[PDB]
Amino acid sequence: DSQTLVVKLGTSVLTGGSRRLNRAHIVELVRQCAQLHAAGHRIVIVTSGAIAAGREHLGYPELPATIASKQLLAAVGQSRLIQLWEQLFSIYGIHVGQMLLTRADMEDRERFLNARDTLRALLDNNIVPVINENDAVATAEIKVGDNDNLSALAAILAGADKLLLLTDQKGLYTADPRSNPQAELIKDVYGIDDALRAIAGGMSTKLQAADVACRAGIDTIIAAGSKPGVIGDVMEGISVGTLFHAQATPLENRKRWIFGAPPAGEITVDEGATAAILERGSSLLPKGIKSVTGNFSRGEVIRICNLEGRDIAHGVSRYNSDALRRIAGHHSQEIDAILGYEYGPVAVHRDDMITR
Amino acid sequence: DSQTLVVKLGTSVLTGGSRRLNRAHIVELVRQCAQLHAAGHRIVIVTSGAIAAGREHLGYPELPATIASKQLLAAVGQSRLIQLWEQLFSIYGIHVGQMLLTRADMEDRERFLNARDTLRALLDNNIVPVINENDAVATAEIKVGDNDNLSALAAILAGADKLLLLTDQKGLYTADPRSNPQAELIKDVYGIDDALRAIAGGMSTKLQAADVACRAGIDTIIAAGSKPGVIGDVMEGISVGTLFHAQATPLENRKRWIFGAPPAGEITVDEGATAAILERGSSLLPKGIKSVTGNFSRGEVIRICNLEGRDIAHGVSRYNSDALRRIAGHHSQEIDAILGYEYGPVAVHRDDMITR
Amino acid sequence: DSQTLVVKLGTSVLTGGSRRLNRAHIVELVRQCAQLHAAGHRIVIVTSGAIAAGREHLGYPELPATIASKQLLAAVGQSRLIQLWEQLFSIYGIHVGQMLLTRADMEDRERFLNARDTLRALLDNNIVPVINENDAVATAEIKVGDNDNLSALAAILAGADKLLLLTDQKGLYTADPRSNPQAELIKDVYGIDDALRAIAGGMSTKLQAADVACRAGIDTIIAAGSKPGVIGDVMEGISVGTLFHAQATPLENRKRWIFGAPPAGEITVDEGATAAILERGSSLLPKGIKSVTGNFSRGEVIRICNLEGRDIAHGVSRYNSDALRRIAGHHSQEIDAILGYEYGPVAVHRDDMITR
């Protein structure tokens, strides 16, 4: 039973509060992730701390306290941190791929599809993808966010089953643990309410990320990074911290994604592909396409109908309108010859369509 | 509370079993219908017996017993019977309009709309329409039917509330009244079943017509023509014979009619007409039309969507695609100048659309 | 879905503030009303401004400023205004009938019934009734009322669905629009309260009329006469001004009207008429009348009891006690022969009775 787990590591976890990255905790977490990877599961890591790596690499220069200095340090520390992650993961014979993402890319229809394809290829080829925010075009308000929302966005993009947010605190407490000896860690949360938001006073960003993840049907867990064996216990199902149950199901999230926007086009599907879609629930091939109407780009939601005209399904197009028009009715092997490139053998994947 | 009532009169009721029409029974029924018309209700009459009128007018010639002779007699008796109906109805100051229909016209999308428009105009101008079967292009297999199915089709076309089938028998009996003194008249029927079909052995055609009418949400009543004041009692709701309750609602029948066939085209609607359709359920005017896609004729079901592309409603077009394209964005008063004709001020009527 | 609308036009709307009637605005309003009438609805018009018509017709004579001069001017302006209204309405092929009413006529039981019958006949024969206050016998305080209360009385009499009061202002305002830029238009009002009365300081008469109409279950709308297409929008349901939702229901108003006073008499009703009244809710016919007890006039609320003497319903008599006694147990076609006149074929109408 392979599962996809997304692990988010804040700068506090990576550095331990110091000016430099502390590699003992990182190597322990890498050991746990390597054990999980060897178990047959899929791991995605969202990291931070490029500024610390940039400071360490440049010999700790005395730059003015300005956003320009932070951008410079991030630019150097991105490469430095990816190098460190690769060195640490090579001990257990695991390759690491770098991915730089921003929220605007996730909002875009086509760039979302491209990022999903890249991540899926990385995961299928047994490579752990390391995801970070592109600090070249980021803003200060994004910088103070510490990739909390980006973690939830990546969890949605990867189709993960659990999202783990490592934090200095042990999780969410009913009251202040310092003042109140009776204050205790909340174990299960089934709905993020205003009372919980009032209780948590940057725990707010983590709460927002957990809400976003749970709304899409992904379980969110907040725990302490220093807790030994936290990743293995999390993935086994043992309780180690505050747990946010998924309010929805992945099918509901897919329905919302497909029906969130009006269709941008329509295609006509022959009898055989109609039977394949309705009875077997299979994907759609360019051979079955008979006519494409409207103008749309790759990733836009389109309408699928048979020869008569009855709507049968809505799906996400993998090619733009011109490409679909040029490759309609041809075998999947001629797509590269016709277009000079290809995005796969299917025009609409079975998991990106809703039938009715 | 005006209601639409459809009365069907077989040749047995009209002639009383004789070779010629018996005008006393007909004038009594006309008196009842005239009382109902003066009460403010709308009456539609489906009649037969053109052959008897043709025989009487031609001096009862000794024609050979052939279908050609029957067509001859029907051709003459159509005019003779319409003349008789007009003479009888003129006594109470009511005009009569003739309409000849066939099931093929009902099946056709456009001819159905044209017939509905003609009937609606006749009913709105306080004129009783008399409906018969066009025997010039008819076959013997429906000549034996005696307008039983045509009565149900006319009831559906007129949007009637009740359908009354006058016949020789008092209605439907549990057993044979002659053999069984315990056999009694069935008063209410809620679902037409195989047991009821086996009970009645041409009552079968009447049962089929009643089933068709009930499936569309129209109450069907079977009574005896010789019963005094039958039409008035049926109008008031008093029990006079076998009653078949409507299994469906008119809204359900409209939904079935709209979604029975896939849309044949799509039109684009501005925001004002979108608000009119959604908030108030108003009809669609040619002014609000922005774009017309596809090819279709008058009466075809089309798809309506706003500027973004989200589907808002499905409706039945009143103009063909070319006419809609030519009159899009114009005021309703310019339709006649643009096209040389018009079908009304609206492009899609509110009662011919289903918001979604 | 035919609806009845009552439109009240003040002198300010008619004259535009000048000394003479501005016929462009009037012809625009008449065009809107004619479109509604052609659509199948029913329109009732309450109008003022006879003084301006009288001044214009008499060549603007130099009269002393006294109520005698106002009455003198109105005595001619009534005819001039009715002539103007019929001239404007004849453009769209609509006839106009004149109705001169006072509040005292509304108070009387029999005069109310006579006025209601006349108005119902006018409406049923597609004739727009123009209603104005009889200034021959009116007082100065009645003149200063500007037919505001008379408009509500006419709306109650006609059983209209909506009442529209055209005025100079755009509607009711939370604060003074001139002084306070934040002042906005109160779109909906569900209950007229002390605060609303304090806010608006002849707006008070309009509020009183709106309250009277709402307590009778008739929606009241206050809008601006200069607003283009205000009448069509009001009929459709668009928000064009302050809307006063009906506090009660028409059934509540009917119950209040019937049970306002104790019955002035009682009649004996046969068992068949009792069955029709109870089971079918039918009206009462002179044939079913068995005995007439007490003395009363036409329009008075009477008590209806069966043969056993049990009270079955309370209704309004369409005849006097003597006439009902004379025509009791006779057919409806002989009422004219017996009495020399006929008030209708029924003794008590179903809508004028309360079964209990």
Add this chain to the structure above:
Amino acid sequence: DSQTLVVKLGTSVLTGGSRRLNRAHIVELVRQCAQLHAAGHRIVIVTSGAIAAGREHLGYPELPATIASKQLLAAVGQSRLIQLWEQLFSIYGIHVGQMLLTRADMEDRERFLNARDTLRALLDNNIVPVINENDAVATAEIKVGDNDNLSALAAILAGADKLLLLTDQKGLYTADPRSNPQAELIKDVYGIDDALRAIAGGMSTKLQAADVACRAGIDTIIAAGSKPGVIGDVMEGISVGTLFHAQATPLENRKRWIFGAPPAGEITVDEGATAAILERGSSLLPKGIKSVTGNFSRGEVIRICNLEGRDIAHGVSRYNSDALRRIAGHHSQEIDAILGYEYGPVAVHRDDMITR
């Protein structure tokens, strides 16, 4: 949704009735299997026809007609056939492993486990295992079987989802297609009954194999090898021939396997391992082993009890009793050091145990 498929190819399919192997059909089937393998599924091949390869390699010598000659030919044809299979599969970059099994090996408890482990390793390393009957120690009656029962045994061993039996006939027929034009293909079979056995008269071996597979919870399909794209259609779900639905479920088959014989021993399990086994359904580790009672070999079903002695589960031991006693309470990484060999890091796998 990766699936495991077992394909059985008779000598008739391989040779087409000739004396030599016809490599065109074989390469077509290899192409289909390679497409399925690239799709991510797992393929297991059971093949025959080594005699033809031996005859071809030896230049078709004139051997006497005896079973000795058949064994002589098979001893070379085995190597020749494996070489041919690997040559054909190397075109699509797929490696091939040889597997020589007999029924007696399946009967033995430990040999069954060894074969299962070898096959699982082959499948997990993306290597297609080719399975054939060891003719060195086989008998003539086994030779007549044509690997029909061996195919079912291999399907059970591999835990395949579907078993495909390719033959010359299109499937199972109600009557003789030649004699009766009305004879048609029996698409679905839910229970193998004596009537079906009477219908089919070496088809009977195929029915026996299908029954054995179905009783183990594996779907069996009989189709024609010459049918184009038969393997892809079988994997998709299209009906290409007679289908034998699984009568039992995999859980039922596992229970039957575990409880077929009484346990040969018992071990004592710590409380943490008990909690993992019961709450989480985890496998049993050598660390949690507290005591080993009785003597048994690897693969025997043994009894699992907690410290209290209560029976918690029944499972299959991956080691012998002596090895388990030696490595009891030791970490998994030291098993190889203690024993000089390792059968895996777990004592009893979760899928090989039945909690109770």
